[PDB]
Structure formats: C-alpha cells, structure tokens
Design a protein around this nucleic acid. Structure first.
Lengths: 639, 69, 38, 141, 62
RNA sequence: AGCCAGGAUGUUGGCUUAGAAGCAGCCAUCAUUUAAAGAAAGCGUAAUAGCUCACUGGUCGAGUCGGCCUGCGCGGAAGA
C-alpha cells in the first residue's frame, strides 16, 4: 500500500543528495526539469543552502517507482550538526550510504554507519562516483569490508572504462555466507549441489530483514550508469510499509521547520491509522488539536492531500507542536539517541549588534530553538551574554548565515566567561571596630578569615558565644558574609574561604540584625584587602581517543597545551589517553584533535578540581557589585 | 610443535565440519565448501599440537574422520 | 635562499662550492642552509 | 636472540604494584595491559623483598604478554639501607656526604655478579665502588 | 512603564516577555504597575501555599 | 678520503620524588668487558626509545691533514 522510507548517509560530503536528485529525475517526469549541475532544485528548499554549496538541514521529497511510494531524505552528512540526521533515523526505516572512492568509506561516514547499527534498521552500500580516476575497483571495496566489520558482499560487479555492469554478477560459489549463517540456508548448503540464485535469495531476504549485511551497489550517478537499477533494488529490497488503517491513529513528530512564508511546518509520520482532514486529534500536551491543513512535499512542488496514508510522512501546520510529541497517544519504539557526543561543542559568545536590535536578535535565537532540536542557549551571565550549545565549525557558519538571511542580526564572540574563582592567600585578623568611630551601623564584628584547602568551598564557625552572637543575629552575619562572597576585590567569586568570626560588640537599643548584616560585608572586604588573594581556575580532565599511529603526534599537542600528561592505554587499533587541561585553553583542544587526527579524532571531558592557579598578572573579570545599600560605605572604606 | 591436520571424511556432518573449517581458517563459505568437497583436504599445516587436537576433537564431536601427521 | 655577504658552514653537511665564480654553500641535508654570495 | 623491539628497563620500587604516577603510561604505552605489572610483577618480587627499584626486561611481542628475566637493582639505591644516609650527591667533592669501606662494598658487589659482566670480581669491585664515588661518597679503604 | 515584581524571587532577566496589571506600590514613586506572577515567561513564586491564586502557584500536587 | 662492522648491564643513579633516563641546569665526569666506546660534540624525545660523531677493526693501498706568514686575485659593489 504505502512505501518504505529511504535514508541518505552521505558521510564526509558524499554528495549522495545529488544522487537523490538524479533519482528524482529517473523517477520522473512526466513534467520536470530533470535537475542540473550544482543547485539546482532537488528539494533544496531554503535559501543559503544551495547558495552555500551544501544543505543546511535534511530535506524531504515524495517519489514513486515500480508502482510504489519512495520517500527519501538528504543529506545532513555535512559537518557538523549531524544530530538532525540522527533525528532522521526515527523518520525512516531504510538507509543508503554513499561510499566514497577515496580509500573506501569516509571515516566520518563510519560514525553514522555505526549509529545506523545502533538504529537496528536495514541499509545498503552504494559505490558512488564510479566514473572517476583512482576508483577502487578492487581496493576501495576491500576498505569497505575491513571498515564495515560485517559480512557485506557485492550484488553486482563492474569496472571501467565506459562499462556499467550491474545484474551480471554475482558471488558464484564463494558468495552465500549470509545464507551459511541461517540454519535453513546452512542446511541447504549442507545438502550440497548448485542451486538457483533466488533460493539463496530467500535466506538473503531473511538476513536482510535483520540487516545482517549491507546489499552490494556500484556505479556513479554522473555517468548515468547503475543509478537506475540500484533504485529498483531500493524499491524491491526495501521492507514493506506497515499498512493497516485498523486504528486508532497514532504517531509522532520527527522534525519541524520555520519557513519564511510558513511561518512554521511540523513534519509528522503516521505510525498507525490515518488522520481525516479538518478533524480533531490527540496531543502530548493533553489538549485537542485539529488538523487544519497538511500536504505531501513533492520534489517538484508541494501538494495538498485530503488525508495521510498509514506509514506516510507529511508536514502539517499547527498552533503548537513540541519535538517528538505524541500524535496518538501513543507510538511505542525503542532506539538509542546521541548528539555528536557532547553537552556543548565549545560554546561561543553571541552579543547582538546595536543597542536595541540585539534584543530582537535573542528572539531570532528563539527562532533557532524552533528549528533543529540539537541546540540550546541561556543567559547564564549577569550581563545576559548568550552561550550557544551548538558546536562545530561549519555549523556556526550555518547559524550565522541563517542569522544573516531570515533575520537581521549578527554577533562575533567565542571567549565567553573565564569562570575564574579567587581564593584567600593567607589568614589575617580584621575588625570593623566598635560603636561609631566610625560608620553605620553601630553593630560590628571581628572577622578572622583563614586559608583553606582547594575545593573546600566556603566555611565558617560561630566562635562567638551567646547571646552576643544572638540566636537570630549571627545568622545575618553569615548571610552577609555570603553577600561578601559574591565578589572579591578583583571581582572574582570567593572560594576556599574560612571565615571564623570572633569579636561581636553591639549596643542593644540601636542594634539590629540588618545592621550587623551590613557590617559583615565590610569585614569580608576588609579581610580580602589583607589576604592578598590568589587566582583559581578550572582544570577538568580530558579523555581522548585517537589512532595509535597519530598518537605520537598527539603527544606534540601536549607541549602546545597547558594540560599535563596523564595515564592512557591502547584499545585495539585505537589508542586512548587521560588528559587534564584548564577550561580556558580546552576549547582549542577540540580543534587540535580535529586537525591532528585528520577528522579521525575523538574526545570527551568534564569539569573538575577548582584548585589550579594561573598566570600571569592575575587578571580578573569585572565586576561586583551594585543595586544594594551600603556599597557607598564600602567605597568610603577604601580611603 | 608442528602438527598437520588433514581432513579425510567430513562424515555425516558436513555442516559442523564446514563450521570447523572456516572457523579454523576463515575462508569464504564457498571456498570451505569446495575444500571439503575436494577431500581429502589439508586443514592446517605446522600448527601447535594443542590447536591440532582442539579441532580434531571438534571433528570427532561432530563425527568426522580426521588425520594427524 | 639566503644571499648573505658572509657564508660560513651552518650544518655539518654544508659544502662550499664556487659555481660561476660566485661562492655558494650547498647543504645536502637541510634546504634552509642553502645560501649564495659571500 | 632477537634485538631491540620493545624492551625497556624502567620501573620504581618493586613493592609498588601497578604504578601510574611512577610508570603507568610507560609500561602500558604499548599493547601490553596495565594489569600485567601487578599480577605478574610480584610473581618474582615476593621471593626477595619489596620497596627495591629492580629493573626488568620487557620484550613485548604480538603475543599479548612478553618474555622477561628480571635483573639487579642499581648500586645507587642500594646505598641507602647499606650506606646509612638515604641521600647522595648534589655536593660531590664540595662536601663528603657519606662513606662506606671496600670491606663492605666489595662484599656486596659480588652479589650482583649474576648480572655483572667481568673476568674477575676485583674489577666489578672497583667499578661499583667507583659508582659509589660519583655520589660524593668516598670509600674508607 | 516600570512594573513592580512581587513575590519572593523571580526568573526575570534582561528581556523575557511578561504580563502587567495595574496597581501602585505606594512605596516606590514612579511605579504604578504589577507583574502577573505565574503568567507567561514569569513563573510563579516557589514553594508558596497560602494565597497562591496570586503569585500563580498551582495546588500542591503532593 | 670513501666501504658492510662495531660504538655495552645496572645509569628509572642520587637531584626540588611531576621528569629529566649520555645530552635544561646541577656537581661527579665511575670502573670494568676490551679491537675500541666520551658515563658523551650534534640530532631526535613529556622523559625514553631512536639516528650520528668521537674512537677502533678490517677492506684499501699512496702521501695527506691543520694552523702561521705573506704575493696577486673573487664576493661584499644599486641611479637616474
């Protein structure tokens, strides 16, 4: 009834989406341009994508061949913000990796491929760009075997020349190990004697349902050879859609996009049943939501539809639609999820241009939140500086170009807050005095801050005896000490404090908890003036995994980084090491591993150990503090 | 420590045999098939006794005729 | 390449020649040590 | 007898099982497991003593583990429990840090002869004792 | 305008769209408005019990 | 002068225990096995490893190397 979804894992800029376009041409017309070199339609959709020379996000395009539906999406294999492509895995059961002719499959492709192995769903190899010099007619496929780590075998063979053989093979005698894995095919193999290719084709279909091995493929789309029959393999080999219509209807959103004329479009697949046009439907928010409009995204043009077929995917407008929201409720599926294995891929500052336009720019950032799920930001800074969770080099170019296109704002930042923490240098006596020699309030105390071990945090004790400490008086001194911990003389946050209160003279008639509480901060700044201070910085551990052959070169990175050498161990061909470097220089470390590994590099880290010390000059980030009474008295204390 | 394991007859367990074969070597299902079908066929040459006896016992478990020389 | 007025041997594998009258210091090892004039 | 492949004479006190600040990445720098220097490192160490830095051959193969024949601790560290002072040089001829005698050091020298290579003991004697001389130590002959 | 942020503590910062009702404060001259706590980007006061129709707090789920 | 050879166990040595492991800096600058080998001139290491020279065999078979003094020359040497 319906048609199975098809992926497009063009890892390392495979260009597989162009293969999707040529496939869109072969499935045509009867009325279509047939596409063209570069961009070019091919469901490029948004501006800045085809102009950029690569899609900024995965698309969609209706198609038909062999009397059946054939949805497909591409490419998202670029960079870099590939997590949306991982989101695409929920959007379809099928797959079609575009293998490079350059040293077998791209190393970036291996991550999406292993992730596909995590997906639990079927996929097939494709020998893209067969019409080119240096093609691995018998070499690159071997790289595909050594890298695939499975049991994939070619369904056809070809070499050229102008040759474009496809169905002529394949794997006589030696082929059929996948059948050997099956007890039935193993039994027929036990029987001996030659047999029809279809007879092993049944067991090949059985293992194919399990995705035990990727189907063979060959030929470049540019040569117009094998680009058609492989699509036929995609049509026949593809798993049947789970058509039913039994109800009740259910499903979930896969992705959503903010078209400029949209203004929004929430794509969703019909996991079961069907939704009648202009009819009410269940939502994850536990509120009614009528389907006012929906239509299939045909590659030549968008088109409206009265109702969605079961197993079909289609965009739909809505007043609201949270990502992965239930359309039932509810669908039940189990799969692993990840986002480039990072909480944040090196966050960078993004202060808006202009005094007022930046405030709208934050709304533009909210619009960015509306787009790809794999992004986050918040104004953690007191200055309300932005800190995007987005990571990667080209992806920043995508968000920036998007800022320059759909919006009218831009910013340039990367350093972000140092997150420095000042600590006391040494213990020293101090006192605000007594009575009013003096300044208000009359309350005063003899604070005695002392040095503490790193990472100990703030500490204090009620050395003062009752009732001079007061059952509800000394606590104001503690909260006031915390108020003085809010910023040091350098403006850095207080750390490793050991404020042992001692003296606490006061007069009853004029004494107030607020007065002593005001007095505390003066004692804190006073002790801080005598302590001498000492800068403290984060030094989170940074585990890393790189190939052993480059492992020596990575050692060269050690000298170039503030991070100390640490224990590490081998893991097969892979190598690993436990680093430990300051967060201030840690951001460039990803670029370093990215450069030294030739993109084969990988790493992870987490913040730890506030103690560290740093140089030079003990620079500090202003500033504290304002919007509170008594600060003028503190300014008076300085002179 | 240089024992040769030859395969004389797969017996009434060509299945298990084929497994032992490819398992001891790693040749393509086909290659393995042909090998056995081309009996007698040398399984291994100049291998550790322990290994030789390991496969040998495996063949016996399946019920095949092996040769140790 | 350097074209200094003085052209002493830098590395060990430096060798002095006098091609076309102009003195040169060719180094089979390091290409940076190649120099003319002098 | 195969030549240089991976064997390296480096580890601290033999009583320190499975080190990471001392050796660590240095012993597990190659494919050999970090565990290999604790379960097997004390299989020979327990027979004599602990806390003594004693070098051992680490000829790594492709066969996971490796073949080895443990040797003999350096004369330097031997001159702490057998010298009195745990220190040494810094000030060789600038000041006499310590002293032993040929009657004791020649006495200890032939013990290490299983590793030492000489035509006669006397030679190893003046050798190791001279090693003692480098530490600022002067032999009470 | 310049509305007074009531309750104890707030999530408001820099921008953040809120909601404004009438009502002076009679202590801060120039301030003639209040913020509707719990409405829009302005969350309700944390851990309130009594008079939670104001401050926007929902009935204790526990 | 060229030519396959050789150019060692502790030296992870004490040192500020983060390393200095012939070679950042220290001082010492061992002595053996020996045709010879500095506990090392340079290179290469987080530090090792590693690659060289000192030195000495043999192959080889006649003059050759480094200063001093001076003579005459070359470079340094681009203008309307």
């Amino acid at each position: 009834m319906k048609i199975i979804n098809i992926g497009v894992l063009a890892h390392v800029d495979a260009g597989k989406t162009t293969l999707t376009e040529s496939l869109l041409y072969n499935s045509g017309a009867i009325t279509e341009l047939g596409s063209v070199d570069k961009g070019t339609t091919r469901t490029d959709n948004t501006l800045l994508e085809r102009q950029r020379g690569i899609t900024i996000q995965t698309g969609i395009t209706s198609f038909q061949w062999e009397n059946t539906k054939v949805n497909i999406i591409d490419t998202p294999g670029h960079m870099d913000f590939l997590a949306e492509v991982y989101r695409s895995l929920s959007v379809l059961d099928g797959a079609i990796l575009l293998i490079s002719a350059k040293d077998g499959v791209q190393a970036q492709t291996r991550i999406l491929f292993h992730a596909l192995r995590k997906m639990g769903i079927p996929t097939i190899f494709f020998i893209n760009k067969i019409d080119q010099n240096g093609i691995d007619l018998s070499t690159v496929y071997q790289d595909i075997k050594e890298k695939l780590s499975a049991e994939i075998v070619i369904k056809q063979k070809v070499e050229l020349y102008p040759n474009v053989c496809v169905t002529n093979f394949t794997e006589s005698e030696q082929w059929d190990t996948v059948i050997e894995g099956n007890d039935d095919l193993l039994e027929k193999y036990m029987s001996g004697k030659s047999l029809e290719a279809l007879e092993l084709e049944q067991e090949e279909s059985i293992r194919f349902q399990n995705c035990s091995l990727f189907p063979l493929y060959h030929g470049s789309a540019k040569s117009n050879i094998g680009i058609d029959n492989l699509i036929e393999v995609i049509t026949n080999k593809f798993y049947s859609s789970t058509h039913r219509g039994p109800s009740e209807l259910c499903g979930n959103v896969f992705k959503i996009e903010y078209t400029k004329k949209r203004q929004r479009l929430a794509y969703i697949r019909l996991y079961s049943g069907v939704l009648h046009l202009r009819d009410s439907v269940r939502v994850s928010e536990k509120e009614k939501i009528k389907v006012t409009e929906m239509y299939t995204s045909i590659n030549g043009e968008l088109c409206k539809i009265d109702r969605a077929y079961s197993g079909e995917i289609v965009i739909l407008q809505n007043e609201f639609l949270k990502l992965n929201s239930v359309l039932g409720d509810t669908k039940l599926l189990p799969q692993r999820k990840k986002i480039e294995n990072p909480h944040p891929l090196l966050q960078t500052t993004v202060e808006p241009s202009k005094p007022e336009q930046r405030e709208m720019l934050l709304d533009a950032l909210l619009e960015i939140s509306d787009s790809d799920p794999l992004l986050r930001y918040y104004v953690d800074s007191t200055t309300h500086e932005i800190i995007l969770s987005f990571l990667g080099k080209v992806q920043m170019e995508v968000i920036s170009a998007l800022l320059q296109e759909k919006y009218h704002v831009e910013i340039e930042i990367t350093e972000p807050t140092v997150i420095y923490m000042e600590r006391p240098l040494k213990n020293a006596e101090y006192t605000i005095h007594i009575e009013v020699p003096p300044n208000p309030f009359w309350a005063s105390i003899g604070l005695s801050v002392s040095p503490l071990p790193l990472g100990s945090g703030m500490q204090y004790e009620s050395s003062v005896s009752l009732g001079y400490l007061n059952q509800s008086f000394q606590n104001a001194v503690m909260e006031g000490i915390r108020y003085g911990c809010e910023q040091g003389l350098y403006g850095w946050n207080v750390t490793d404090c050991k404020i042992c209160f001692k003296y606490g003279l006061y007069y009853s008639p004029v004494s107030t908890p607020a007065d002593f509480r005001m007095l505390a901060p003066i004692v804190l700044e006073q002790v801080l003036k005598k302590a001498g201070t000492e800068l403290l910085e984060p030094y989170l551990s940074f585990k890393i995994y790189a190939p052993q052959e480059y492992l020596s070169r990575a050692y060269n990175d050690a000298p170039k980084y503030c991070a100390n050498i640490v224990d590490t161990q081998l893991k097969n061909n892979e190598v690993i090491l436990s680093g430990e470097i300051p967060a201030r220089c840690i951001q460039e470390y990803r670029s370093d591993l990215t450069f030294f590994t030739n993109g084969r590099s990988v790493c992870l880290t987490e913040l730890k150990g506030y103690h560290v010390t740093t140089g030079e000059p003990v620079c500090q980030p202003r500033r504290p503090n304002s919007r509170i009474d008594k600060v003028r008295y503190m300014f008076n204390k300085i002179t | 420590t240089e024992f040769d394991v030859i395969l004389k007859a797969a017996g009434a367990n060509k299945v298990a045999v084929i497994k032992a074969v490819r398992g001891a070597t790693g040749l393509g299902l086909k290659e393995a098939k042909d090998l056995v079908e081309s009996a007698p066929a040398a399984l291994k040459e100049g291998v550790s006794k322990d290994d030789a006896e390991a496969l040998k016992k495996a063949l016996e478990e399946a019920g095949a005729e092996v040769e140790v020389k | 390449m350097k074209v200094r007025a003085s052209v002493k041997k830098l590395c060990r594998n430096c060798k002095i020649v006098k091609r076309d009258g102009v003195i040169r210091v060719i180094c089979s090892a390091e290409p940076k040590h190649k120099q003319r004039q002098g | 007898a195969k030549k240089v492949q991976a064997y390296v004479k480096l580890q601290v006190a033999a009583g320190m099982a499975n080190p990471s600040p001392p050796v660590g990445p240095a012993l597990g720098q190659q494919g050999v497991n970090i565990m290999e220097f604790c379960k097997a490192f004390n299989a020979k160490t327990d027979s004599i003593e602990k806390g003594l830095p004693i070098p051992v051959v680490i000829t790594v193969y492709a066969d996971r583990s490796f073949t080895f024949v443990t040797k003999t601790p350096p004369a330097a560290v031997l001159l702490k429990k057998a010298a009195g002072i745990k220190s040494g040089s810094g000030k060789p001829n600038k000041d006499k840090v310590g002293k032993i005698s040929r009657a004791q050091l020649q006495e200890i020298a032939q013990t290490k002869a299983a590793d030492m290579t000489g035509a006669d003991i006397e030679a190893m004697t003046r050798s190791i004792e001279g090693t003692a001389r480098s530490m600022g130590l002067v032999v009470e002959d | 305008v310049t509305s007074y942020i009531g309750g104890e503590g707030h999530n408001l910062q820099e921008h953040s769209v809120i909601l404004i009702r009438g009502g002076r404060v009679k202590d801060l001259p120039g301030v003639r408005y209040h913020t509707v706590r719990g409405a829009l980007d302005c969350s309700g006061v944390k851990d309130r019990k009594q008079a939670r129709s104001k401050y926007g707090v929902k009935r204790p789920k526990a």
